[PDB]
Amino acid sequence: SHMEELQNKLEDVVIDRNLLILGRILGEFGSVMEGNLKQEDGTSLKVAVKTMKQREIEEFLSEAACMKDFSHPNVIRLLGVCIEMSSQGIPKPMVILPFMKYGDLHTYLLYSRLETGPRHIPLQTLLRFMVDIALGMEYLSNRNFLHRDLAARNCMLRDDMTVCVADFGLPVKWIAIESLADRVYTSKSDVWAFGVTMWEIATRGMTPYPGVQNHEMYDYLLHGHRLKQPEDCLDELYEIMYSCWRTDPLDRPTFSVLRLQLERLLESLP
Ligand SMILES: Nc1nccc(Oc2ccc(NC(=O)c3c[nH]cc(-c4ccc(F)cc4)c3=O)cc2F)c1Cl
Ligand SMILES: [Cl-]
Ligand SMILES: [Cl-]
Ligand SMILES: [Cl-]
Ligand SMILES: [Cl-]
Numbered sequence: 001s002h003m004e005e006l007q008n009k010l011e012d013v014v015i016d017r018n019l020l021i022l023g024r025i026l027g028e029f030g031s032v033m034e035g036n037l038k039q040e041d042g043t044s045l046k047v048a049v050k051t052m053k054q055r056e057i058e059e060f061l062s063e064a065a066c067m068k069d070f071s072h073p074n075v076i077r078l079l080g081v082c083i084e085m086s087s088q089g090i091p092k093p094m095v096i097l098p099f100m101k102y103g104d105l106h107t108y109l110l111y112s113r114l115e116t117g118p119r120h121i122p123l124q125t126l127l128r129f130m131v132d133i134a135l136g137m138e139y140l141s142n143r144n145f146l147h148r149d150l151a152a153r154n155c156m157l158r159d160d161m162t163v164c165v166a167d168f169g170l171p172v173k174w175i176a177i178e179s180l181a182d183r184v185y186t187s188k189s190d191v192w193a194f195g196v197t198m199w200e201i202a203t204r205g206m207t208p209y210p211g212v213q214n215h216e217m218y219d220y221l222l223h224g225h226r227l228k229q230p231e232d233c234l235d236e237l238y239e240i241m242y243s244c245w246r247t248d249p250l251d252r253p254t255f256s257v258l259r260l261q262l263e264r265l266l267e268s269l270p
Helices: 002-011 054-068 105-112 123-139 177-179 187-202 216-224 237-242 255-268
Strands: 020-027 033-038 044-051 080-085 091-099 155-157 163-165
Touching: 002 054, 020 044, 044 105, 054 080, 054 091, 105 155, 105 187, 123 187, 123 255, 177 187, 177 216, 187 237, 187 255, 237 255
Parallel strands: none
Antiparallel strands: 020 033, 033 044, 044 091, 080 091, 155 163
């Protein structure tokens, strides 16, 4: 039953604080730390730990339990959560994820445009990044999960270069036209944000809409303007991402449709 499934998820989301040791800051709303997690088989695992600052706390726990129960290779796996208490009596919620040494997709795309950073990223890999993200989002949306902050900064690179969808939980230019006004939000709003994320990846990390300030943003879209085609972006890839920003959400493709369009384009590549 609905209460049964929720209580089951709740049961195995919590990690004993003594199985975890925190390490150095990776980033600093909250902070992200490197850490170690003792697994049940006796060995420890490198993890990332995210820390923040009672009705909100059950909300954090139940939403963490829901994400951990999700399982798909292009959705970040949430290993568990841990609730500390601060001296001043403020709870300190912590989220445990696998440590991914390649970091987030956005910083990686930027790094790749520096000699010392990752090598230049071929088109084939850039489109394989989009396929991966579309796969995680297909799985999520088939569950009526709404992401609401999709962007390359929130996609993570795994050791085998698989991309998985995440949310640091810590952006006008990613928000669908209808959500800018009515604040209505559907998976078709997520589809809009995916289109922009595809554009981030194709530009190797440009901020969307150069020359357009955030306050000008809804007016800019109101008159039918969209993100421009990056150079050396295939026209077929640009039409796919343009389809994500159709004015009428109902006309935008689903993630399942997008994913197959993108897998089709990828195999056509010599
Ligand atoms: N190097 C390195 N390696 C690993 C992680 C890392 O940082 C982090 C990267 C991601 C996260 N995510 C979360 O806390 C999180 C919490 N609730 C829900 C989601 C979620 C939301 C939507 C969705 F579709 C999928 C998941 C989360 O993602 C935390 C980090 F600390 C770093 Cl920096
Ligand atoms: Cl060990
Ligand atoms: Cl990994
Ligand atoms: Cl643009
Ligand atoms: Cl345009």
